[PDB]
Amino acid sequence: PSVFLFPPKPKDTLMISRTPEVTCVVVDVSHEDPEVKFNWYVDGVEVHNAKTKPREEQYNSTYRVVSVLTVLHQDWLNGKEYKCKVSNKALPAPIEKTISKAKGQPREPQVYTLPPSRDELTKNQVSLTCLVKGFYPSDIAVEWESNGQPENNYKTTPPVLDSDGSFFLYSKLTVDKSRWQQGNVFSCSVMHEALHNHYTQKSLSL
Amino acid sequence: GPSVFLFPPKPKDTLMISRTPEVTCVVVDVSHEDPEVKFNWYVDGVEVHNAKTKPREEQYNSTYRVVSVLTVLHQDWLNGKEYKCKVSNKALPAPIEKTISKAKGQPREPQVYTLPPSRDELTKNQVSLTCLVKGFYPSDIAVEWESNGQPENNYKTTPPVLDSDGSFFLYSKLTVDKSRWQQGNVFSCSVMHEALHNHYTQKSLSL
Ligand SMILES: *[C@@H]1O[C@H](CO[C@H]2O[C@@H](C)[C@@H](O)[C@@H](O)[C@@H]2O)[C@@H](O[C@@H]2O[C@H](CO)[C@@H](O[C@@H]3O[C@H](CO[C@H]4O[C@H](CO)[C@@H](O)[C@H](O)[C@@H]4O[C@@H]4O[C@H](CO)[C@@H](O[C@@H]5O[C@H](CO)[C@H](O)[C@H](O)[C@H]5O)[C@H](O)[C@H]4NC(C)=O)[C@@H](O)[C@H](O[C@H]4O[C@H](CO)[C@@H](O)[C@H](O[C@@H]5O[C@H](CO)[C@@H](O)[C@H](O)[C@H]5NC(C)=O)[C@@H]4O)[C@@H]3O)[C@H](O)[C@H]2NC(C)=O)[C@H](O)[C@H]1NC(C)=O
Ligand SMILES: *[C@@H]1O[C@H](CO[C@@H]2O[C@@H](C)[C@@H](O)[C@@H](O)[C@@H]2O)[C@@H](O[C@@H]2O[C@H](CO)[C@@H](O[C@@H]3O[C@H](CO[C@H]4O[C@H](CO)[C@@H](O)[C@H](O)[C@@H]4O[C@@H]4O[C@H](CO)[C@@H](O)[C@H](O)[C@H]4NC(C)=O)[C@@H](O)[C@H](O[C@H]4O[C@H](CO)[C@@H](O)[C@H](O)[C@@H]4O)[C@@H]3O)[C@H](O)[C@H]2NC(C)=O)[C@H](O)[C@H]1NC(C)=O
């Protein structure tokens, strides 16, 4: 049996309206031993808010038991430490897995929008590029809009550790060349904890 | 018991006949009770005997580590031949087998575009030169920066990202002093991929 611990979504922790949560996933539970017990602690103090989602039966005669704990936005952003304690009959000793936010001074991202290369103008579609660099930690959310409507044909690279100790990434939005040439306005939206109101956007148009 | 890992060649090694592409089979957690290890190599299911096995190395956790390296032909790898490493040990109920090959699928030619720094970034001491590569399959690729015939140092490249059409794309960012950019120096982004003619292409960028 193995224990995995997953952090909340960056967008959930940056907006008060949303609900962030820490997920503790237990895999490779055998048929003979389906009993799994969960204990949650926050900086040592034990909490009792966790809930256990229904367990799945996978393609190899095992079970995946998942426990979810809701966290406060400010506790996570302050660097509080969350640990998941798992006990099972097959285990010799209880397993403890620990997670928290990355430590360090947060740094404000810089957002630049880049128009399509002149070479790409011969194609039927063009690439709109959003460059975000110099931010820390790596938790971040990027979205594209146009006239207040979310564009959906975009892909974002994972954060990459830059040479100065910060992170950078690129986001690529693909639109029809006709939409670009007509003067439409496209925006790149960035959410990070070091930004004022955790939000900024840069526009891009011909 | 022992665990087996199988590593593919480096992309530059398969794309240039001057270099030597290799496939590495690694066996870890070999106990002192049964330190003997045997390797059997198979190319498309046919056994080969030109592999080089290196003497076992004792790790500080009281376990041995044995490595076997097979040299491959460039055209064999690019044609999708499967390579199989078979590891035999007396502590194993059965031999362990691992197979590796190039990703299946029709190759697609990369498109390379160079993007100048954003006008907003010109207020900084450092500016960002962006190289965009998209539409390539498989994801094995090499991206390098150079200027005036000499390689550049301060560049980073993102991992390949699966796009919406089933092909890959990535970005490479070169960081230079604004003074060098504004003086008209020419920076070029060179890309190595199997779908390219001569496996090499180059796109320049300057002011
Ligand atoms: C028998 O079957 C078992 C189950 O069957 C399934 O498993 C597969 C075989 C597959 O074929 C399935 O078809 C099959 O049904 C199987 O159990 C396997 O075991 C695997 C390992 O043995 C394990 O792989 C690991 O996966 C994790 C992450 O897994 C997530 O992502 C995958 C996709 O990549 C998802 O498919 C999966 O469901 C998991 O989902 C993520 O977790 C949650 C839950 O969804 C999400 O978070 C929440 O999301 C919600 C919304 O959905 C909310 O947003 C909420 O707020 C969130 O919290 C999360 O988003 C999901 N992810 C995504 C993308 O959506 C990988 O991380 C593992 O990679 C490891 O790689 C190295 C190599 O060892 C490890 O070292 C490393 O560990 C850590 O690395 C850190 C580095 O940063 C380091 O700091 C740590 O110290 C280090 N830890 C340790 C201990 O070293 C990584 O962990 C790895 O690939 C499979 O996930 C698991 N199955 C399932 C279903 O989970 C058995 O193997 C199989 N065989 C046998 C013999 O039993
Ligand atoms: C006893 O100790 C062994 C050696 O550890 C070292 O020595 C001891 C004394 C300590 O000092 C250690 O701190 C020290 O590290 C352990 O062996 C290790 O076992 C683990 C698994 O149990 C192996 O992890 C696997 O690593 C794969 C990648 O490994 C490459 O990259 C490593 C750096 O990140 C590098 O250290 C490796 O040597 C290897 O390097 C590549 O080698 C090839 C061929 O030589 C080259 O072509 C590449 O260019 C090299 N690349 C680089 C970057 O250098 C992972 O891919 C792999 O993950 C895969 O499998 C897991 C399942 O386990 C999947 O979940 C995952 O998705 C993925 O598919 C895995 O993590 C590790 O490599 C071993 N170390 C060595 C040196 O071989 C023993 O485990 C330990 N025994 C016990 C009981 O503890």
Swiss-Prot record, chain A:
Residues with attached carbohydrate: 60
Disulfide-bonded cysteines: 24-84, 130-188
Result for mutant: residue 198 to R: Enhanced ability to activate the classical complement pathway
Region listing for Constant (C) domain, in residue ranges: 1-206
Subcellular location: Secreted; Cell membrane
Residue ranges constituting the Ig-like domain according to the UniProt record: 1-100, 109-205
Effect recorded for residue 196 to A: Impaired ability to activate the classical complement pathway
Described purpose of this protein according to its UniProt entry: Immunoglobulins, also known as antibodies, are membrane-bound or secreted glycoproteins produced by B lymphocytes. In the recognition phase of humoral immunity, the membrane-bound immunoglobulins serve as receptors which, upon binding of a specific antigen, trigger the clonal expansion and differentiation of B lymphocytes into immunoglobulins-secreting plasma cells. Secreted immunoglobulins mediate the effector phase of humoral immunity, which results in the elimination of bound antigens.
Subunit structure: Immunoglobulins are composed of two identical heavy chains and two identical light chains; disulfide-linked.
Protein name, as recorded: Immunoglobulin gamma-1 heavy chain
Organism from which the protein derives: Homo sapiens (Human)
Included range, full protein: 240 to 445 of 449
From Swiss-Prot, chain B:
Effect of residue 93 to A: Impaired ability to activate the classical complement pathway
Cysteines paired by S-S bonds: 25-85, 131-189
Domain of life: Eukaryota
Effect of mutating residue 91 to K: Impaired ability to activate the classical complement pathway
Record note on what altering residue 64 to R does: Impaired ability to activate the classical complement pathway
Region (Constant (C) domain): 1-207
Consequence of changing residue 64 to D/A: Enhanced ability to activate the classical complement pathway
Glycan-bearing residues: 61
Function comment: Immunoglobulins, also known as antibodies, are membrane-bound or secreted glycoproteins produced by B lymphocytes. In the recognition phase of humoral immunity, the membrane-bound immunoglobulins serve as receptors which, upon binding of a specific antigen, trigger the clonal expansion and differentiation of B lymphocytes into immunoglobulins-secreting plasma cells. Secreted immunoglobulins mediate the effector phase of humoral immunity, which results in the elimination of bound antigens.
Name the UniProt record assigns to this protein: Immunoglobulin gamma-1 heavy chain
Organism encoding this protein: Homo sapiens (Human)
Residues of the full protein shown: 239 to 445 of 449
